[PDB]
Amino acid sequence: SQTVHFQGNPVTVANSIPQAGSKAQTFTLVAKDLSDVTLGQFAGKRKVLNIFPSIDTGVCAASVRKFNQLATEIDNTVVLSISADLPFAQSRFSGAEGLNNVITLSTFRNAEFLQAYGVAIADGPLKGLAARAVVVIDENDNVIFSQLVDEITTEPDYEAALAVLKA
């Protein structure tokens, strides 16, 4: 169990976000066309999981775009923008500014992902949503960076997260 903050209140987050060195667990999440997508179909690539409570709450489009562009400019990298938003809402966010290698995935029917990756908000009003977090997974499916953002509405340390992909 972890504690982050929202609206000046403690928020319980289940289990533990994997620390660098951890084997990244398998998952299935849902793509914009409602097909199932697995961690395993990104074999060989490094993966940046940008995880949000929602893409309709608290997030600025232009911020997320800029990170997405910096991330996908790094060699052999895919960004997985993950939230409990249905796929239809994640597609409004991504409108017609989808760059290469930025892939939206929903946890709406794969809640076990949030447990496994230690991002399941367990209480308060955001209960059932993903906490704000960034997990970077290497080409061998080992986590090489993670941040569970302590204040849920603030921005993750995107710089530290990408620095790891240079090495």
Q: Between 129 and 131, whose beta carbon lies closer to its own copies?
A: 129
Just list the catalytic residues.
60
Stretch that binds its own copies, among 11-19, 78-86, 140-148, 157-165 (CB under 8 A): 78-86
Amino acid identity for residue 76 in this structure: N
**Candidate residues 84, 102, 148, 161; the one interacting with its own copies per rule CB under 8 A:** 84
Residue indicated by tokens 């892939």: 103
Amino acid identity for residue 24 in this structure: A
Pair of tokens at residue 162: 């990408």
Q: Considering CB distances under 5 to 8 angstroms, the limit depending on partner class, which of Cl ion, its own copies, none binds residue 70? A: none
Q: Considering CB distances under 5 to 8 angstroms, the limit depending on partner class, which of its own copies, Cl ion, none binds residue 38? A: Cl ion
The separation between the first and the last C-alpha atoms of the chain, rounded to the nearest angstrom, is 31
Residue 31 to residue 87: CA distance in whole angstroms: 7
- Interface with Cl ion by CB under 5 A: which residues? 26, 38-40, 149-150, 155
Residue 163 to residue 81: CA distance in whole angstroms: 19
* Residue 163 near its own copies by CB under 8 A: no
Residue 52 to residue 143: CA distance in whole angstroms: 18
* Residue 34 near its own copies by CB under 8 A: yes
Interface positions with its own copies (CB under 8 A): 33-35, 54, 56-57, 84-86, 88-89, 92, 108-109, 125-129
